[PDB]
Design an enzyme around this catalytic site. Structure first.
Site, PDB file in Angstrom:
ATOM      1  N   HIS A  98      85.366  45.970  90.794  1.00 29.78           N
ATOM      2  CA  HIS A  98      85.736  44.644  90.311  1.00 29.78           C
ATOM      3  C   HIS A  98      86.972  44.119  91.039  1.00 29.78           C
ATOM      4  O   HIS A  98      86.965  43.011  91.590  1.00 29.78           O
ATOM      5  CB  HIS A  98      85.967  44.710  88.794  1.00 29.78           C
ATOM      6  CG  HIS A  98      86.590  43.479  88.207  1.00 29.78           C
ATOM      7  ND1 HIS A  98      85.886  42.592  87.416  1.00 29.78           N
ATOM      8  CD2 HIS A  98      87.855  43.003  88.271  1.00 29.78           C
ATOM      9  CE1 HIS A  98      86.691  41.617  87.032  1.00 29.78           C
ATOM     10  NE2 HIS A  98      87.890  41.840  87.543  1.00 29.78           N
ATOM     11  N   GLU A  99      88.051  44.899  91.051  1.00 31.92           N
ATOM     12  CA  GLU A  99      89.321  44.380  91.557  1.00 31.92           C
ATOM     13  C   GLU A  99      89.248  44.032  93.035  1.00 31.92           C
ATOM     14  O   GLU A  99      89.915  43.093  93.487  1.00 31.92           O
ATOM     15  CB  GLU A  99      90.433  45.395  91.336  1.00 31.92           C
ATOM     16  CG  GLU A  99      91.023  45.394  89.966  1.00 31.92           C
ATOM     17  CD  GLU A  99      91.465  44.018  89.529  1.00 31.92           C
ATOM     18  OE1 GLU A  99      90.806  43.469  88.633  1.00 31.92           O
ATOM     19  OE2 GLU A  99      92.441  43.471  90.082  1.00 31.92           O
ATOM     20  N   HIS A 124      88.632  40.420  93.949  1.00 29.61           N
ATOM     21  CA  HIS A 124      89.728  39.461  93.840  1.00 29.61           C
ATOM     22  C   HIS A 124      90.409  39.249  95.187  1.00 29.61           C
ATOM     23  O   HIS A 124      90.833  38.131  95.504  1.00 29.61           O
ATOM     24  CB  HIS A 124      90.738  39.928  92.782  1.00 29.61           C
ATOM     25  CG  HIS A 124      90.273  39.718  91.376  1.00 29.61           C
ATOM     26  ND1 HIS A 124      89.682  38.543  90.966  1.00 29.61           N
ATOM     27  CD2 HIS A 124      90.302  40.524  90.286  1.00 29.61           C
ATOM     28  CE1 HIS A 124      89.372  38.628  89.684  1.00 29.61           C
ATOM     29  NE2 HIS A 124      89.740  39.817  89.247  1.00 29.61           N
TER      30      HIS A 124
HETATM   31 ZN   LIG Z   1      89.561  40.616  87.331  1.00 32.50          ZN
END
Ligand SMILES: [Zn+2]
Ligand SMILES: [Ca+2]
Ligand SMILES: [Ca+2]
Ligand SMILES: [Ca+2]
Lengths: 12, 21, 532
Positions: free
Chosen positions: C400-401, C404
């Site tokens: 997920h990260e 970003h």
């Molecule tokens: Zn996030």
């Protein structure tokens, strides 16, 4: 930020 | 700087963001 | 438990409820609906319950007390509610009654008992000292607890809990004028605090986290002036001499170094630039995945490095194809290679990431985009391994990260704070969509449960509520919907976000929230039915 304590961790 | 840590600190938290200067 | 029984206007009813239901049921009042909080924590109830608590505390004979644990929890639960609930606000005669009840427990001959049953009530008393704004009132007790502590006390879980509460008192005292006015002259407190931090028997023991908290609160004392200043300095010097920034006692050393650095002159302690030296020591492995990803790690295997690089490498290509980026970064962005900084554990992250990256660590990691236009800016994702993380890299939240960073460099102009419209739905939704693709049972489950959000509501999402259901699951649902059904609109939105045209972005998704709501609802239906 100051925040007042909620609950303390109980023994596992 | 951080608040004092409680006896138990959660390992599987969600992320944060923002300041890291 | 019956939370309604705390709502009676008779204080005796409320006292009967506290006594008969006990601390476990009182726990509910912290998070009860406002109606119950306004009725449970009437100023008259706080006063009458504190007056009963005073008489019980005077009679306390040691060995713990279920009733006193429940009463003091209730009182500080009231101060919690008063702080967060605008409709709970105590009249001026409440806190002196609470202070009298704390006094009664403190003055009891059994105050310094060592037992887990005592620790359970003592814990709520010490926390009440902070919750009720009494940080200025019990410094001799803080001092005694710090000096009386030993390895016998440290055997007891609830004694560790209780005495660790004195660092909460020191921390919360910053906002207390009588505390600020006096703490700089508390030479015995300062000596006891320093010697608590210096207890060698705490290293590797169950109470090491306490010695670390003491080191931190001692360094925070450098923000005050008074007759205690030279004792504070002497004890901090002994901490920095006795321990090291990486190795034995480093939780204490680093706890102290953090506040010393922020509040004092690092050169008076010889710890200037410690953050960069620490980084080289802790993050001692370097593994370059590619020109766009480099890993710095504390203790990962080669297999872990290879698996992290191939997982991110796959996500990277998938992101660039899905977002139709042409691998063209946004303007004014020279974050050409993500640095992925992976600590060996949550504990190591809590100990080392803070000073290295100047971040708070009560979280699961974080991506620091910084200022992409500044020469020398370094894009840093800060994370840790965990046993229940995803194989085969076992880096918590990695997949997920990582998105970003890619969303930040290729989709969203500027640093993290550049948008002038809400974009949390997109930032979190695209991180979930790219990393999870169509495997997201939690997202299905939040449709099935019957409670849903509209496109218009999703687009207004903020981190404030920290509604993870709304942020991560419904962010994903809206992003997935737009990609599957309206990809051309997404491409049109990305022209605006890539340039920082945040008003055009908002006007663009405003159109979506009115046009597509009913189709969004049918899309959810198909998704549920596919699951069956
Ligand atoms: Zn996030
Ligand atoms: Ca490891
Ligand atoms: Ca950006
Ligand atoms: Ca739901």
């Amino acid at each position: 930020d100051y925040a007042p304590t909620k609950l303390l961790p109980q023994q596992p | 700087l951080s608040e004092p840590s409680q006896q138990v600190t959660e390992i599987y938290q969600h992320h944060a963001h923002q300041n890291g200067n | 438990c019956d939370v309604e029984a705390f709502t009676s206007n008779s204080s005796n009813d409320v006292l009967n409820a506290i006594k008969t239901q006990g601390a476990s049921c009182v726990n509910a009042l912290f998070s009860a609906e406002s109606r119950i909080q306004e009725a449970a924590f009437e100023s008259g109830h706080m006063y009458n319950i504190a007056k009963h608590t005073t008489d019980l505390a005077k009679a306390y004979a040691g060995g713990g007390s279920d009733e006193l644990e429940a009463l003091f929890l209730y009182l500080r639960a009231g101060y919690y509610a008063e702080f967060y609930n605008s409709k709970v606000s105590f009249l001026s005669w409440v806190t002196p009654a609470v202070k009298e009840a704390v006094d009664a427990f403190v003055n009891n001959a059994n105050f310094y008992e060592n037992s887990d049953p005592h620790g359970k009530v003592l814990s709520e008393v010490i926390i009440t000292m902070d919750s009720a704004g009494l940080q200025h009132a019990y410094l001799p007790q803080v001092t005694q607890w710090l000096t009386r502590w030993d390895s016998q006390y440290a055997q007891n879980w609830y004694m560790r809990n209780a005495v660790n509460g004195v660092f909460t008192i020191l921390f919360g005292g910053q906002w207390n004028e009588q505390f600020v006015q006096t703490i700089g002259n508390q030479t015995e407190l300062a000596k006891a605090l320093g010697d608590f931090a210096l207890r060698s028997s705490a290293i590797g023991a169950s109470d090491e986290f306490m010695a670390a908290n003491a080191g931190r609160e001692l360094g925070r004392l450098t923000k005050y002036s008074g007759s205690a200043s030279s004792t504070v300095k002497s004890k901090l010097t002994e901490i920095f001499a006795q321990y090291e920034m990486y190795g034995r006692g480093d939780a204490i050393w680093l706890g102290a170094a953090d506040t010393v650095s922020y509040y004092a002159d690092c050169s008076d302690y010889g710890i200037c630039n410690f953050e960069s030296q620490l980084k080289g020591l802790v993050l001692s492995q370097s593994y370059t995945c590619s020109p766009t990803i480099r890993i710095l790690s504390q203790n990962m295997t080669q297999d872990q490095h290879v698996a992290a690089c191939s997982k991110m490498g796959y996500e990277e290509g998938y992101f660039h194809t899905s977002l139709e980026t042409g691998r063209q970064p946004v303007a004014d962005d020279y974050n050409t290679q993500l640095q992925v900084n992976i600590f060996d554990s949550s504990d190591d992250y809590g100990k080392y990431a803070g000073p290295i990256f100047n971040i708070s660590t009560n979280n699961g990691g974080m991506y620091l985009e910084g200022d992409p236009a500044t020469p020398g800016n370094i894009p840093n994702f800060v994370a840790y391994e965990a046993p229940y993380a995803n194989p085969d890299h076992f880096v918590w939240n990695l997949e997920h990260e990582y998105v970003h960073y890619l969303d930040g460099r290729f989709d969203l102009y500027g640093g993290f704070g550049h948008p002038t419209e809400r974009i949390v739905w997109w930032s979190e939704g695209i991180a979930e969509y790219v990393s999870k693709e169509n495997d997201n049972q939690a997202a299905i489950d939040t449709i099935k449960d019957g409670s849903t959000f509209t496109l218009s509501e999703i687009f207004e999402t903020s981190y404030d509520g920290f509604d993870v259901d709304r942020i991560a699951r419904w962010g994903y649902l809206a992003v997935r919907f737009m990609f599957e059904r309206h990809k051309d609109d997404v491409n049109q939105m990305l022209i605006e976000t890539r340039q920082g045209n945040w008003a055009n972005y908002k006007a663009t998704i405003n159109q979506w929230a009115i046009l597509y709501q009913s189709e969004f609802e049918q899309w959810q239906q198909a998704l549920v039915l596919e699951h069956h």
